[PDB]
Write an enzyme that holds these catalytic residues in place. Structure first.
Site, mmCIF file in Angstrom:
data_model
loop_
_atom_site.group_PDB
_atom_site.id
_atom_site.type_symbol
_atom_site.label_atom_id
_atom_site.label_comp_id
_atom_site.label_asym_id
_atom_site.label_seq_id
_atom_site.Cartn_x
_atom_site.Cartn_y
_atom_site.Cartn_z
ATOM 1 N N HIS A 355 0.814 -1.212 0.000
ATOM 2 C CA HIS A 355 0.000 0.000 0.000
ATOM 3 C C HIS A 355 0.851 1.267 0.000
ATOM 4 O O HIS A 355 0.788 2.063 -0.943
ATOM 5 C CB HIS A 355 -0.932 -0.010 1.214
ATOM 6 C CG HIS A 355 -1.614 1.295 1.460
ATOM 7 N ND1 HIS A 355 -2.244 2.005 0.462
ATOM 8 C CD2 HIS A 355 -1.770 2.019 2.593
ATOM 9 C CE1 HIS A 355 -2.756 3.112 0.969
ATOM 10 N NE2 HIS A 355 -2.482 3.144 2.262
ATOM 11 N N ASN A 356 1.652 1.462 1.041
ATOM 12 C CA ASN A 356 2.547 2.610 1.157
ATOM 13 C C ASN A 356 3.959 2.055 1.260
ATOM 14 O O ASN A 356 4.475 1.836 2.358
ATOM 15 C CB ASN A 356 2.192 3.485 2.360
ATOM 16 C CG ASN A 356 1.158 4.545 2.031
ATOM 17 O OD1 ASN A 356 1.075 5.015 0.899
ATOM 18 N ND2 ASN A 356 0.367 4.931 3.026
ATOM 19 N N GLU A 385 3.140 1.427 -4.744
ATOM 20 C CA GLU A 385 2.411 2.682 -4.848
ATOM 21 C C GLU A 385 3.372 3.860 -4.797
ATOM 22 O O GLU A 385 4.389 3.815 -4.100
ATOM 23 C CB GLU A 385 1.373 2.809 -3.730
ATOM 24 C CG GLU A 385 0.273 3.808 -4.040
ATOM 25 C CD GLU A 385 -0.897 3.703 -3.090
ATOM 26 O OE1 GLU A 385 -0.705 3.915 -1.876
ATOM 27 O OE2 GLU A 385 -2.016 3.406 -3.558
ATOM 28 N N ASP A 387 3.075 8.083 -4.391
ATOM 29 C CA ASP A 387 2.262 9.277 -4.152
ATOM 30 C C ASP A 387 2.992 10.536 -4.620
ATOM 31 O O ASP A 387 3.228 11.469 -3.856
ATOM 32 C CB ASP A 387 1.895 9.378 -2.675
ATOM 33 C CG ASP A 387 1.007 8.240 -2.219
ATOM 34 O OD1 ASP A 387 0.769 7.316 -3.020
ATOM 35 O OD2 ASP A 387 0.544 8.270 -1.059
ATOM 36 N N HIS A 400 3.553 11.161 1.837
ATOM 37 C CA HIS A 400 2.140 11.145 2.191
ATOM 38 C C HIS A 400 1.628 12.580 2.234
ATOM 39 O O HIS A 400 2.109 13.394 3.027
ATOM 40 C CB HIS A 400 1.934 10.448 3.533
ATOM 41 C CG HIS A 400 0.523 10.016 3.778
ATOM 42 N ND1 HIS A 400 0.069 9.629 5.019
ATOM 43 C CD2 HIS A 400 -0.533 9.900 2.938
ATOM 44 C CE1 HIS A 400 -1.207 9.299 4.935
ATOM 45 N NE2 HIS A 400 -1.597 9.455 3.683
ATOM 46 N N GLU A 434 -0.598 7.444 -7.156
ATOM 47 C CA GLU A 434 -1.520 8.399 -6.544
ATOM 48 C C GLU A 434 -1.080 9.789 -6.994
ATOM 49 O O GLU A 434 -0.529 10.588 -6.235
ATOM 50 C CB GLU A 434 -1.527 8.263 -5.027
ATOM 51 C CG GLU A 434 -2.011 6.918 -4.509
ATOM 52 C CD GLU A 434 -2.165 6.900 -2.997
ATOM 53 O OE1 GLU A 434 -1.838 7.917 -2.351
ATOM 54 O OE2 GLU A 434 -2.614 5.871 -2.450
HETATM 55 CA CA LIG Z 1 -1.144 6.630 -0.717
#
Ligand SMILES: [Ca+2]
Ligand SMILES: Nc1nc2c(ncn2[C@@H]2O[C@H](COP(=O)(O)OP(=O)(O)OP(=O)(O)O)[C@@H](O)[C@H]2O)c(=O)[nH]1
Ligand SMILES: [Mg+2]
Lengths: 887, 178
Positions: A355-356, A385, A387, A400, A434
């Site tokens: 996820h992260n 992922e 971001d 984040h 993201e």
């Molecule tokens: Ca994220």
């Protein structure tokens, strides 16, 4: 000596391994201080440690090659220009003179060690280092690591006080769990290993009981893990009988409560011959081995030359037979990639995801690691992922959004993926963006992808099958060593609420998106549909599953569907994936920085199929041949329209179930993690102050309807502290039958070397009377049944061999089996009607003084299935079967 | 309820024969030196069914080093000797008694006379005639046990299996009590 990485494991060229051993002059670069100094790194006589000192810390230190995760050449972290000016050296190419060693002690700590050396030195330095790390990579995947535990423990004693000597017996006995004791002194490595063996054979009462039943009084006198590494096997010759008796004597006296004391009576010794061992494999283990293979086991495990010569198997031979790597519970051990399963479309596979990846801890305050992308991708994870938010200098930075987490350059995160994406596996990785970036930067986010990945990145449909009327995503095998990115694609004509991506997307970045065109989940109540990969937080997916369970299964079987933890989990925990895996969801994203049960299930599931990260979904999904295709609703609380496959589990005993805690009261909890209809937990009564060899001997019975996706979980628990200290999660579909050992693991899901459990697990079955159908028959697709095969041992076959194993289909009957037996003997004209198969049941028992009971007889009538009768033999009742051919 | 015991002797006197016969009811046919053996047997005494674990020792010099293995705290430690050899009567009780006391005190001892059957054998008299000896007398057997402070005295015969079961009955009862 005591090579920490033995010679039989290494595959280094002779010259290359000499260069590291002799030493070399290299420049050590320190990123933190950003200052390079000269050093002389040498490989210690034991092949573990690397030491660099001033040529004849920056220039003083030591690396432990058991922590290195990967070795890279020309890692962009090295500043060759800085080194050249600092060391006044000529022009150098970092892609030809740099060496890196990503090492760490945790999944969240990934340091770096930089060495730059002349062109000639780099090749040997890197080439040798790669082999040393590759050996380290394998040694940490071996199923049986008892010997590798002794090497570390002995060498640790060797260098504990700075004095080069072995451990005294009082220390050696204590380390193995024996009594806390004087006479002897420092013991060589052979005398140390030969003492551990006596502790692993003289501390297992439960293996004596399984030996007494099947033993006979036959007198005393007439690519995998390398065998040399296996402690138990006999060929591990790398001491006279006098020493061995002493070794067993001290081991048998140090054990406290449960111990097979060394009984030595002449003219009264029992054994397990070829026939006796076969009766143990046919009934308990379920293994059907030919005469030669059974004999080869005798020649391979029996220590005593006298016994091994006359085809016997003493207690040491039998006890060492059940502790081998071929008698471990999980079939996933030493499992290699199966290229046949990787041919179906990509929608049918459970894909490992994170996820992260950048985050290393809490997801609102912590660090973002550039190298945690390389650490994760080495574990085998196949989805990550990014971001990408915004560059203060214009270059995008991953972090984040709207939070205090550290910001890492995007350029160094795409590179981190490239250098370690396809090191462990080779199946494609799906990158999720993201993309919270303004339009100008996305152009600089598209150059990086095409500049770094180059050929790996997919720019257009690579396969003609993608242009069909109703295309499906290509097979993972087809996309081998490829990278796919997913994010919104242009339509051609307090908790931070930062989930909203960029409204506008560049026409350059979007063009890279091909096989994963993320879009907002249209819904189930409300280009081909097979490409759109939605992404729903656990709350949205969990809510969707319950309300539309059946609808979802037929949706995720034609297009991917990603899930990630809910924003409410600021703790950076994971959701239980079994809820989503049942419905076909492929990319169940998890937080790899936190080690909890939901992350062990992902590790447990994806350790199979070679660890490639792509595990085929159960055939009930994605298959139109399965009779239970569209009728499967996992969330249903009761389905009495099928007969489950009753399972019996017995926790016979465990050994060293509380490492580093000699005094404890361990109890093993078995949790069946499946649907909400066939999930249950069991507890074994605690055993006080016994962790060396606890023996509970509980029995647990559970019924499973959907056995394709169920995960057993054994978790040692100390009642005094109620804190787990060793756990292991294995699928029920990958649990060997019979008396098998289970290798436990610590809370961080790291292998415990000596700890394990001894269990008996037999898959019973109910008799089909026609009212209801077996669960296995329904879920299991018809095509997969044809692949099933079974082997049955038939005695009295013509020829010198007392018996032979015949491979038969599941539906084969007795009539056919006669033809197969007589088919081999074409030389002699034999009539099938003359012979008739007969079933026997030898009433063996622990008691031997009384005369043997007459063996029960029966006639296997024609048209009666032969596999069915083989499944009716329960050695629990004290009889062992035989299919014996008679006139 | 499981008890523990350790047996010592003069070597080649019947230490292993006594245990095999008791636990197997078969007299050994071929002699083999013993290093360290452990046996488990069940005996009922005065209505008490108590599991009995036997620890076998050795007296050979090469095997004298590993004697402490079975020494640690045990309910009882037994004593054995060959009746045919007067030498075992003197040295063995004096040799091992300080050792038993030093390693594990508060452990009652029992003295067992082995090779009772051949005490009356004519061949024994001729063999001891050369060395100017006679078979160990029953009177000195009891006195020696009292000298070393033992629970009692007994005599056993491996071949005839006479009095073997008596020693275990007396020994097992002492273990639980006191
Ligand atoms: Ca994220
Ligand atoms: N006929 C007879 N012989 C006995 C008797 N007791 C002991 N022996 C002899 O003593 C020997 C006993 O040897 P083991 O069974 O090995 O016991 P051990 O004396 O401690 O010898 P080790 O193996 O060194 O321990 C036998 O071989 C017999 O010949 C007995 O009661 N009757
Ligand atoms: Mg002996």
């Amino acid at each position: 000596g005591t090579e920490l990485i033995p010679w039989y494991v290494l595959s280094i060229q002779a010259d290359v391994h000499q260069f590291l051993l002799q030493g070399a002059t290299v420049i050590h670069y320190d990123q933190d201080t950003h200052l390079s100094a000269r050093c002389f790194l040498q490989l210690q006589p034991d092949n573990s440690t690397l030491t660099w000192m001033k040529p004849p810390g920056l220039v003083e230190g030591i690396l432990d090659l058991f922590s290195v995760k990967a070795v890279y050449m020309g890692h962009p972290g090295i500043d060759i220009h800085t080194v050249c000016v600092q060391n006044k050296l000529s022009s150098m190419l970092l892609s030809e003179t740099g060496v890196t060693l990503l090492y760490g002690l945790q999944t969240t700590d990934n340091r770096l060690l930089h060495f730059v050396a002349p062109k000639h030195t780099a090749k040997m330095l890197f080439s040798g280092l790669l082999e040393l790390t590759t050996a380290v990579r394998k040694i940490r995947k071996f199923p049986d690591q008892r010997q590798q535990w002794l090497r570390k423990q002995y060498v640790s004693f060797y260098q504990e006080d700075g004095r080069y000597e072995g451990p005294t017996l009082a220390h050696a006995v204590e380390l193995f769990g024996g009594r806390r004791w004087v006479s002897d002194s420092n013991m060589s490595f052979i005398e140390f290993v030969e003492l551990f063996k006596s502790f692993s054979i003289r501390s297992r009462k439960d293996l004596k009981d399984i030996f007494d039943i099947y033993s006979v009084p036959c007198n005393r006198s007439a690519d995998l893990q390398p065998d040399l590494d296996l402690l138990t096997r006999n060929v591990s010759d790398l001491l006279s009988d006098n020493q061995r008796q002493i070794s067993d004597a001290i081991a048998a006296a140090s054990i406290v409560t449960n111990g097979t004391g060394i009984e030595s009576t002449s003219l009264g010794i029992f054994g397990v011959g070829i026939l006796q061992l076969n009766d143990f494999l046919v009934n308990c283990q379920g293994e059907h081995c030919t005469y030669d293979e059974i004999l080869s086991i005798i020649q391979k495990f029996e220590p005593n030359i006298s016994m091994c010569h006359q085809g016997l198997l003493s207690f040491e031979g039998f006890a060492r037979f059940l502790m081998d790597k071929d008698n471990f519970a999980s079939k996933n051990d030493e499992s290699r990639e199966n290229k046949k399963d990787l041919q179906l479309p990509l929608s049918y596979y459970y894909i490992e995801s994170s996820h992260n990846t950048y985050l290393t801890g809490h997801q609102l305050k912590g660090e973002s690691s550039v190298e945690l992308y390389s650490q994760v991708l080495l574990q085998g994870c196949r989805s990550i992922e990014l971001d990408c938010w915004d560059g203060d200098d214009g270059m995008p930075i991953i972090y984040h959004g709207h939070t205090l987490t550290t910001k890492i350059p995007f350029k160094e995160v795409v590179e981190a993926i490239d250098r370690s994406a396809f090191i462990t596996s080779d199946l494609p990785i799906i990158i999720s963006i993201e993309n919270h970036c303004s339009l100008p930067q996305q152009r600089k986010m598209a150059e990086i992808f095409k500049s770094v990945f180059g050929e790996k990145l997919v720019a257009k449909f690579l396969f003609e099958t993608d242009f069909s009327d109703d295309p499906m995503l290509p097979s993972p095998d087809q996309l081998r060593r490829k990278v796919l990115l997913k994010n919104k694609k242009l339509k051609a004509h307090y908790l931070p609420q930062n989930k909203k991506e960029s409204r506008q997307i560049a026409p350059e970045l979007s063009d890279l998106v091909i096989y994963c065109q993320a879009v907002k989940f249209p819904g189930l109540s409300t280009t081909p549909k097979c490409y759109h990969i939605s992404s729903l937080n656990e709350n949205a997916a969990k809510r969707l599953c319950r309300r539309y369970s059946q609808k979802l299964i037929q949706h995720t079987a034609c297009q991917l569907l990603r899930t990630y933890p809910a924003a409410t989990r600021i703790d950076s925990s994971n959701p239980n994936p079994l809820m989503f895996w049942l419905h076909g969801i492929q990319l169940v994203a998890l937080n790899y920085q936190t080690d909890d049960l939901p992350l062990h299930l992902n590790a447990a599931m994806f350790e199979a199929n070679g660890g490639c990260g792509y595990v085929l979904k159960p055939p009930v999904l994605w298959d139109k041949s399965c009779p239970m295709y569209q009728k499967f609703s996992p969330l249903e609380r009761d389905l009495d329209a099928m007969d489950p496959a009753t399972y019996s589990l017995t926790i016979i005993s465990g050994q060293n179930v509380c490492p580093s805690n000699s005094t404890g009261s361990p109890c093993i909890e078995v949790d069946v993690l499946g649907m909400p209809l066939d999930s249950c937990h069991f507890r074994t009564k605690p055993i006080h102050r016994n962790t060396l060899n606890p023996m509970w001997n509980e029995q647990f019975l559970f019924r499973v309807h959907f056995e394709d996706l169920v995960f057993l979980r054994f978790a040692v628990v100390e009642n005094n502290s109620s804190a787990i200290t060793a756990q292991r999660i294995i699928p029920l579909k990958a649990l060997k039958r019979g008396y098998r050992h289970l290798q436990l693991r610590n809370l961080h899901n790291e292998i415990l070397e000596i700890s394990s459990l001894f269990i008996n697990s037999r898959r019973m079955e109910d008799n089909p009377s026609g009212s209801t159908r077996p669960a296995s028959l329904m879920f299991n697709t018809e095509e997969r049944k044809c692949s099933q095969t079974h082997k049955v041992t038939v005695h009295g076959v013509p020829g010198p061999e007392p018996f032979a194993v015949f491979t038969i289909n599941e539906g084969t009957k007795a009539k056919q089996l006669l033809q197969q037996i007589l088919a081999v003997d074409q030389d002699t004209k034999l009539t099938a009607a003359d012979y008739f198969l007969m079933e026997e049941k030898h009433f063996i028992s622990k008691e031997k003084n009384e005369c043997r009971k007459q063996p029960f007889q029966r006639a296997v009538g024609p048209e009666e299935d032969i596999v069915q009768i083989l499944n009716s033999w329960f050695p629990e009742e004290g009889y062992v079967g035989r299919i014996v051919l008679k006139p | 309820i499981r008890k523990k015991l350790v047996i010592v002797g003069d070597g080649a006197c019947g230490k292993t024969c006594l245990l095999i016969v008791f636990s197997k009811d078969q007299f050994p046919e071929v002699y083999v030196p013993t290093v360290f053996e452990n046996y488990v047997a069940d005996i009922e005494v005065d209505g008490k069914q108590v599991e009995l674990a036997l620890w076998d020792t050795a007296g050979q010099e090469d095997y004298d080093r590993l004697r402490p293995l079975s020494y640690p705290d045990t309910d009882v430690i037994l004593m054995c000797f060959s009746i045919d050899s007067p030498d075992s009567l003197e040295n063995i009780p004096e040799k091992w008694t300080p050792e038993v006391k030093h390693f594990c005190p508060n452990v009652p001892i029992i003295l067992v006379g082995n090779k009772k059957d051949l005490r009356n054998d004519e061949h024994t008299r001729r063999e001891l005639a050369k060395m100017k000896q006679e078979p160990v007398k029953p009177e000195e057997g009891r006195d020696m046990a009292n000298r070393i402070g033992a629970f009692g005295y007994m005599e056993c015969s491996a071949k005839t299996k006479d009095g073997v079961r008596e020693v275990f009955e007396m020994a097992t009862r002492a273990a639980l009590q006191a």
